[PDB]
């Protein structure tokens, strides 16, 4: 009931979704392996390492 | 100068102004600027030429 007063459309999002606890990785066509590797690949590797 | 036309052989009505002027060839030649592309190499990331 109190979510539209936070001006969020509850069909397009929920307030629980602003905190990420799972994280999509982009496909290989978005980060080309011969640029060697793209910066997003390194940052994702470091996130896996810190996990 | 009184100047005769080379095409018709008849002289010209107005006089023509001859003299040696120092022209200098600049580096912008058309053989270095003519360019075309049908289809060729594209970028890897954004697949456009």
Curated annotation (Swiss-Prot), chain A:
Component of the RNA polymerase III (Pol III) (Pol III) complex consisting of 17 subunits: a ten-subunit catalytic core composed of POLR3A/RPC1, POLR3B/RPC2, POLR1C/RPAC1, POLR1D/RPAC2, POLR3K/RPC10, POLR2E/RPABC1, POLR2F/RPABC2, POLR2H/RPABC3, POLR2K/RPABC4 and POLR2L/RPABC5; a mobile stalk composed of two subunits POLR3H/RPC8 and CRCP/RPC9, protruding from the core and functioning primarily in transcription initiation; and additional subunits homologous to general transcription factors of the RNA polymerase II machinery, POLR3C/RPC3-POLR3F/RPC6-POLR3G/RPC7 heterotrimer required for transcription initiation and POLR3D/RPC4-POLR3E/RPC5 heterodimer involved in both transcription initiation and termination. Belongs to the RNA polymerase beta' chain family. This is DNA-directed RNA polymerase III subunit RPC1. Expressed in the brain, in the cortex and the white matter (at protein level). Catalytic core component of RNA polymerase III (Pol III), a DNA-dependent RNA polymerase which synthesizes small non-coding RNAs using the four ribonucleoside triphosphates as substrates. Synthesizes 5S rRNA, snRNAs, tRNAs and miRNAs from at least 500 distinct genomic loci. Pol III-mediated transcription cycle proceeds through transcription initiation, transcription elongation and transcription termination stages. During transcription initiation, Pol III is recruited to DNA promoters type I, II or III with the help of general transcription factors and other specific initiation factors. It is found in: Nucleus; Cytoplasm, Cytosol. It comes from Homo sapiens (Human). It is linked to Leukodystrophy, hypomyelinating, 7, with or without oligodontia and/or hypogonadotropic hypogonadism: An autosomal recessive neurodegenerative disorder characterized by childhood onset of progressive motor decline manifest as spasticity, ataxia, tremor, and cerebellar signs, as well as mild cognitive regression. Other features may include hypodontia or oligodontia and hypogonadotropic hypogonadism. There is considerable inter- and intrafamilial variability.
From Swiss-Prot, chain B:
It is linked to Leukodystrophy, hypomyelinating, 8, with or without oligodontia and/or hypogonadotropic hypogonadism: An autosomal recessive neurodegenerative disorder characterized by early childhood onset of cerebellar ataxia and mild intellectual disabilities associated with diffuse hypomyelination apparent on brain MRI. Variable features include oligodontia and/or hypogonadotropic hypogonadism. Catalytic core component of RNA polymerase III (Pol III), a DNA-dependent RNA polymerase which synthesizes small non-coding RNAs using the four ribonucleoside triphosphates as substrates. Synthesizes 5S rRNA, snRNAs, tRNAs and miRNAs from at least 500 distinct genomic loci. Pol III-mediated transcription cycle proceeds through transcription initiation, transcription elongation and transcription termination stages. During transcription initiation, Pol III is recruited to DNA promoters type I, II or III with the help of general transcription factors and other specific initiation factors. This is DNA-directed RNA polymerase III subunit RPC2. It is found in: Nucleus; Cytoplasm, Cytosol. Component of the RNA polymerase III (Pol III) complex consisting of 17 subunits: a ten-subunit catalytic core composed of POLR3A/RPC1, POLR3B/RPC2, POLR1C/RPAC1, POLR1D/RPAC2, POLR3K/RPC10, POLR2E/RPABC1, POLR2F/RPABC2, POLR2H/RPABC3, POLR2K/RPABC4 and POLR2L/RPABC5; a mobile stalk composed of two subunits POLR3H/RPC8 and CRCP/RPC9, protruding from the core and functioning primarily in transcription initiation; and additional subunits homologous to general transcription factors of the RNA polymerase II machinery, POLR3C/RPC3-POLR3F/RPC6-POLR3G/RPC7 heterotrimer required for transcription initiation and POLR3D/RPC4-POLR3E/RPC5 heterodimer involved in both transcription initiation and termination. Belongs to the RNA polymerase beta chain family. It comes from the Eukaryota. The lineage of its organism: Eukaryota, Metazoa, Chordata, Craniata, Vertebrata. RNA binds at residue 33.
């Amino acid at each position: 009931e109190d979510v539209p007063l936070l001006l969020m459309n509850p069909e397009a999002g929920k307030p629980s979704d602003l905190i990420l606890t799972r994280l999509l990785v982009p496909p290989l066509c978005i980060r080309p392996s011969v640029v060697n590797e793209d910066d997003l690949t390194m940052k994702l590797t470091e996130i896996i390492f810190l996990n | 100068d009184y100047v005769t036309s080379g095409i018709t052989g008849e002289p010209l009505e107005a006089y023509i102004y001859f003299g040696p002027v120092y022209y200098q060839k600049l580096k912008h030649m058309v053989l270095d600027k003519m360019h075309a592309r049908a289809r060729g190499p594209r970028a890897v990331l954004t697949r456009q030429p």
